[PDB]
Every structure is written in C-alpha cells, then in structure tokens.
Amino acid sequence: GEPVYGLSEDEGESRILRVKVVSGIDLAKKASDPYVKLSLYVADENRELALVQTKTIKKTLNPKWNEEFYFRVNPSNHRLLFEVFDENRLTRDDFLGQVDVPLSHLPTEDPYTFKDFLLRPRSHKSRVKGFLRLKMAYMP
C-alpha cells in the first residue's frame, strides 16, 4: 500500500527493501539547499535501475528530510547510491557527498535503529564532510 521503485527483471530474486532518508548532518559549505538523489543500480555493470530524489530543504547544512522509499532489489547483485546535492537555480546542482551501500547484508524487519553513514567524495582527490542518517531493512 505504498509506492515501490524499480521493476523486477527476475521475480525469483527480488525483495522489497524499505529505506528512510532521515537527515543530513554537518554538510560541507561549497545558499545551501540540500536534497538526496537515490540511485538503485546493478553492481559491476554500474547500470541504473531506479532514480528518485528527496525534497529540497532550503538554507541549511543540517537538513531533516524524513522521507521513506520502498525499492524492489536483488540483494546479492544490486547496490544503492545516495548522493547529497545542493540544489541551484541557475547552475548545475552541487555535489556534497555520497554513500554507496551494498544490499547483501542489511537487516530484515517487519515495519534508534538508524545509522549515520560517513559521506564520501566522488573521487579520492576531493573531500566532503558530515554524515547521512539512514534506516534500511528488508520486508520479511
């Protein structure tokens, strides 16, 4: 009774993963107007399977999104990328950091169990700061 992101390629390998994007914490100042873009993708192939973004919160380095998403995923072969961007009107949105999560060993839970994931740069050559607070668990 909720929207699901991703279409199955093999129904005998997919599972429903619940993801809540809670908040961003202590983001880098590069007006800061953050949102998170979530990309479900196939590992190794680096092939996008579903793309969705949170609302933008205006003028903050400590945005509280509290948004929930359900994804259709293959736990062994898919990964979820979270990228934080600063939304801009007249220039490309600025990248603020990422968290790339494997889905193979996430807990399972029928709907303080969030985790604060360290934001990482796109390349080793850059630096970001802060954390992205996420809760993720499979539907049984």
Curated annotation (Swiss-Prot):
The protein's name in its UniProt record: E3 ubiquitin-protein ligase NEDD4-like
Annotated tissue distribution: Ubiquitously expressed, with highest levels in prostate, pancreas, and kidney. Expressed in melanocytes.
Subcellular location: Cytoplasm; Golgi apparatus; Endosome, Multivesicular body
Induction: By androgens in prostate, and by albumin in kidney.
Known role: E3 ubiquitin-protein ligase that mediates the polyubiquitination of lysine and cysteine residues on target proteins and is thereby implicated in the regulation of various signaling pathways including autophagy, innate immunity or DNA repair. Inhibits TGF-beta signaling by triggering SMAD2 and TGFBR1 ubiquitination and proteasome-dependent degradation. Downregulates autophagy and cell growth by ubiquitinating and reducing cellular ULK1 or ASCT2 levels.
All residue ranges annotated as the C2 domain in the record: 1-112
Known partners and oligomeric status: Interacts with UBE2E3. Interacts with NDFIP1; this interaction activates the E3 ubiquitin-protein ligase. Interacts with NDFIP2; this interaction activates the E3 ubiquitin-protein ligase. Interacts (via WW domains) with SCN1A. Interacts (via WW domains) with SCN2A. Interacts (via WW domains) with SCN3A. Interacts (via WW domains) with SCN5A. Interacts (via WW domains) with SCN8A. Interacts (via WW domains) with SCN9A. Interacts (via WW domains) with SCN10A. Interacts (via WW domains) with CLCN5. Interacts with SMAD2. Interacts with SMAD3. Interacts with SMAD6. Interacts with SMAD7.
Disease: Periventricular nodular heterotopia 7: A form of periventricular nodular heterotopia, a disorder resulting from a defect in the pattern of neuronal migration in which ectopic collections of neurons lie along the lateral ventricles of the brain or just beneath, contiguously or in isolated patches. PVNH7 is an autosomal dominant disease characterized by delayed psychomotor development, intellectual disability, and seizures in some patients. Additional features include cleft palate and toe syndactyly.
Gene name for this UniProt entry: NEDD4L
Disulfide bond annotation, renumbered to this chain: none
Residues of the full protein shown: 6 to 154 of 975
Domains (record comment): WW domains are involved in recognizing PPxY motifs in substrate proteins.
Entry PTM: Phosphorylated by SGK1 or PKA; which impairs interaction with SCNN. Interaction with YWHAH inhibits dephosphorylation.
